[PDB]
Paper text:
Superoxide dismutase-1 (SOD1) is one of the most abundant human proteins and is an important part of our antioxidant, redox signalling and respiratory control mechanisms. SOD1 folding, zinc and copper acquisition, and disulphide bond formation can be catalysed by the copper chaperone for SOD1 (CCS), which forms a transient heterodimeric complex with SOD1 to facilitate its maturation. Here, we discover the mechanisms that govern SOD1 maturation and stabilisation through interaction with the chaperone protein hCCS.
When homodimeric hSOD1 and hCCS domain II are physiologically zinc metalated, many of the terms that comprise binding free energy are equal due to their sequence and structural similarity. The presence of a stabilising Coulombic interaction between opposing hCCS Arg104 and Asp136 residues (3.55 Å), which is not present in hSOD1, appears counterintuitive in this regard. However, the hCCS dimer interface is replete with positive charge and therefore not dominated by the hydrophobic effect seen in hSOD1 and many other protein complexes. Most importantly, however, the presence of hCCS Ala231 significantly weakens half of the homodimer interface hydrogen bonds conserved from SOD1. Specifically, Ala231 side-chain methyl pushes Arg232 and Gly135 apart through steric repulsion, lengthening the carbonyl-amine hydrogen bond between them to 3.08 Å from 2.75 Å, in the case of the homologous SOD1 residues Ile151 and Gly51. Without this rearrangement, hCCS Ala231 Cβ would be an energetically unfavourable 2.3 Å from the Gly135 carbonyl oxygen. Introduction of the hCCS Ala231Gly amino acid substitution to mimic the hSOD1 dimer interface increases hCCS dimer affinity, slows complexation with hSOD1 more than 300-fold, impedes hSOD1 activation, and hSOD1 disulphide formation. Thus, relatively weak CCS homodimer affinity has been evolutionarily maintained to provide a pool of monomeric CCS available to interact with and activate nascent monomeric SOD1 within a physiologically relevant timescale. The SOD1-like, hCCS domain II found within each complex structure has an intact intra-subunit disulphide bond in contrast to the yeast orthologue. This disulphide does not dictate complexation but does thermally stabilise the hCCS homodimer and the complex with hSOD1.
Author numbering:
A (entry chain A): 85 to 235
B (entry chain B): 85 to 236
């Protein structure tokens, strides 16, 4: 690997979890973990600018966006670098997930935050005033700082 | 400035606080904090390798030491990059401190941990087998993940 990181998440309600990052190759970052306490269904998952938790998830800034792109889904060419699309919580409120990203690098996101949202990310497709800005996924439920790890 | 960071400390006991970093110039990093819940007296303060809290303060690794130096005080040229010496808690258990460090950089610290110790850092001077390794300051009381904060 070329770097490992871990985000330990929590928030003002029931939502908590642990998500790990591993830069498998220079091209591919593995992001995998488990978040629970969720309502069943799709929840937006994004990396945000900052990891400042002094105002809980409010001091984390916006989706990480170094290239000045619009909001999109993880497969889209026009996406914020922090845009990881949705994860699904099952009927027990548990989201166990695994994705690889080609844009996000561990070395870029160290000390930033990983945040899960109240609702579904529309992936910029929703035709809503927020679609190309946030994905219209409602409140931030839980956040964790992306911290360096031995792995 | 050339970057900002923040760490929120907690541990198993009463120790907690907030510490902020700002890289003022290429030479100088401002570190300013308040930590409460301490026993009165001197406590070691260090940046450690990792910000991984999955085993609480035990997964943070050792003092950050990219240059393979010996442990020292913050004004020494033989020190770990992460060596910030002692902070003093007053009679009420509060340590308010402000340092300007010439070696530690804000880009060093982010994603790592800031840890405050049970006892006094001997600054490498104590003649003990741990002096040049840790400063012999006992247990870890509290640790905070050092996060990026807004630079403007
Ligand atoms: Zn976005
Ligand atoms: Zn040291």
């Amino acid at each position: 690997n070329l770097g490992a990181a871990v985000a330990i998440l929590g928030g003002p309600g029931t939502v908590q979890g642990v998500v790990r990052f591993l830069q498998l190759t220079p091209e591919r970052c593995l992001i995998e973990g488990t978040i629970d306490g969720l309502e069943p269904g799709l929840h937006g998952l994004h990396v945000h600018q900052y990891g400042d938790l002094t105002n809980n998830c409010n001091s984390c800034g916006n989706h990480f966006n170094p290239d000045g792109a619009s909001h999109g889904g993880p497969q889209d060419s026009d996406r914020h670098r922090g845009d990881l699309g949705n994860v699904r919580a099952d009927a027990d409120g548990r989201a166990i997930f695994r994705m690889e990203d080609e844009q996000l690098k561990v070395w870029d996101v160290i000390g930033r935050s990983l945040i899960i949202d109240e609702g579904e990310d529309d992936l910029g497709r929703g035709g809503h005033p927020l679609s190309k800005i946030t994905g219209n996924s409602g409140e931030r439920l839980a956040c964790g700082i992306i911290a360096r790890s031995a792995g």
